[PDB]
Structure 1
Amino acid sequence: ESADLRALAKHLYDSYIKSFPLTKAKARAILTGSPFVIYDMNSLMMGEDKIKFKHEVAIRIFQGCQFRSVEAVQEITEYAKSIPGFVNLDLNDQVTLLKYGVHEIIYTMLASLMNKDGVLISEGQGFMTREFLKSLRKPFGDFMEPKFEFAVKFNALELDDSDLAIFIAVIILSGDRPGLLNVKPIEDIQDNLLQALELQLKLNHPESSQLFAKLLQKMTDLRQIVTEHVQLLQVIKKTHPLLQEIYK
């Protein structure tokens, strides 16, 4: 019934607002008419004075990137549990859906903070030019570049938060994660989410044909770059004890 799908869509959007402090609406405002910009080395070390952070440079930026991801994982976990029927699944399965899902969702939402020329950082207090990041030493200079390419493609679909809120729910409820014990309910929820997302895209983007389909195709792009992302970390194993424990 289209009435309840519209309710599901509003429920998730409200939960997403609570779970994610820096919305896409907010990020896009900041990128388009003031956050300190980081375009080279001098601007960076200036930027710890302006925007306060935690305790060489290529590695320091990589690491602080992990910090944020751990922060992100908690936001996604908290959002995940507001998905109807999620907490009711077998606890191991919830843990399995998150394990394989948080990456795909992080890159999805990193797209909201990026454009052609760089990426907002630190709750949007900052902006890191895309040029400075590729200026970084091999292989560091090559880490965020593949994401920039995915983001600009992805942002071309002109999704808003209310779209993204359902979309990422769909990501979490993937019935093909290894090690799932009871896939019936997982796929039951996903189809519901898929319905809500199909209607949402229609009402919210009437003039955009088959956007639903085009969006589902991007989940190919996501899983590809997630694979390629883990293998890029697994050439930086070619490189505290509690810190490595907090970030494993």
Structure 2
Amino acid sequence: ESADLRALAKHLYDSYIKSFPLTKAKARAILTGSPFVIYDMNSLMMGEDKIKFEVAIRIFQGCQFRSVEAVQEITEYAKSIPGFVNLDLNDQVTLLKYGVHEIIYTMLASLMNKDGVLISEGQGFMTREFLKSLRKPFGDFMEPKFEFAVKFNALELDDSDLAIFIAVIILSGDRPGLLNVKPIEDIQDNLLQALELQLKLNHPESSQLFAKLLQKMTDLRQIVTEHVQLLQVIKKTETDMSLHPLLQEIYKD
């Protein structure tokens, strides 16, 4: 019934808000009028001065601490998902391990636009161009991200929505490795039931948004494909580049 779903639809908005500190609603406020903009190496060097923190490497090692903290938050988010904790532990570690990345770039879209990305909690902004002109093996780690973000941000989801979506992701069940898929799918069938109603109410003028949302996992899967191969080359150029251990468990290529 409507009531049982609307209620789960709030339970999740609540956990999302407690577990994620830069929300899409907060990000958009910073981006629609303040951050320090970074566009060349001269501003970036003024940028160590201005905002809390070779050129492309200690950028990259910084983009990956931010992902380590984001895996930390995703986990905390996922526990609050009704039913998740009540699942074979090998699955909880597998739903987590594959469903992180798909979520990072969903939520990373909340910090992007046509022109750039907000770094370092909001304090800074990195132009799309500084990113698209970096060292040969680093200068496109974030390019396809931007093109998804603009495709994605188009749907104009907000946080009440993203929070059920972020949940439909985690609870996949089409994941490689899972033992007991039937309870995973049985949970997600409820999220999907929840999400469908959320969209029809928060965005009632957005025809086939549910359908058009669900389709973005196709775009989303592809993005992570491109990422693991891209990371594989940097572990061959920079065999001196150390990756974080938490991030390494998520990489069974």
Q: Which bin holds the TM-score, normalised by the shorter protein?
A: over 0.9
Q: TM-score, normalised by structure 2?
A: 0.93
Tell me the CA shift for residue 237 of structure 1. 1.1
Are 2:8 and 2:194, in contact at CA under 8 Å, matched by a contact in 1? yes
Uncovered stretches (5+) of structure 2, i.e. residues with no partner: 237-243
1:16-49 Cα offsets, whole Å, 9 max, x none, are 0000000100000000011111111111011111
Distance 2:202 2:52 in 1: 39
- Preserved CA contact (<8 Å) 2:68 2:246: no
Superposed CA offset, 1:84-115 (max 9, x none): 00000111110000000000000000000000
- Runs (4+) off by over 4 Å: 240-248
Kindly indicate whether the alpha-carbon contact (under 8 Å) linking 2:39 and 2:130 is maintained by their aligned counterparts in 1: yes
Shift of 1:247: 10
Q: Is the 8 A contact 1:105 1:168 kept in 2?
A: yes
Structure 1 Cα separation of the partners of residues 109 and 35 of structure 2:
18
Q: Determine if contact 1:70/1:247 at 8 Å carries over to the other structure.
A: no
What displacement does 1:68 show? 0.4
Structure 1 range deviating more: 229-238 or 157-166 = 229-238
Q: Conserved in 1, the CA contact under 8 Å of 2:116 and 2:125?
A: yes
Stretches of structure 1 lacking an aligned partner (at least 5 in a row): none
- Indicate if the aligned counterparts of 1:163 and 1:201 stay in contact, CA closer than 8 A: yes
Deviations, residues 150-193 of structure 1 (Å, cap 9, x unaligned): 00000000000010000010000001111111111100110000
Q: Cα gap change, 1:206/1:247 in structure 2, threshold over 3 Å: closer, same or farther?
A: closer
CA change 1:183–1:244 in 2 (3 A) is: closer
Assess, with a 3 A threshold, how the Cα gap between structure 1 residues 246 and 191 changes in structure 2: closer, same or farther.
closer
In the aligned structure 1, how far is the partner of 2:198 from the partner of 2:245?
Answer: 46
**Matched residue of 1:6: which SS?**
helix
Once the 2 structures are TM-superposed, how far is the Cα of residue 246 of structure 1 from its aligned partner?
12
Deviations 1:38-92 (A, max 9, x none): 1111110111111121xx0111111111100000000000000000000001111
Residue 139 of structure 1: CA displacement?
Answer: 2.2
Percent same amino acid at aligned positions? Answer: 100
Could you say what secondary structure the match of 2:86 adopts? coil
- Aligned positions of 1:18-37 closer than 5 A: 18-37=18-37
TM score, norm. by length of structure 1 = 0.95
How many residue pairs match? The answer is 245
Distance 1:243 1:6, change over 3 A: closer
The answer (yes or no) to whether the contact 1:36–1:127 under 8 Å persists in 2 is yes
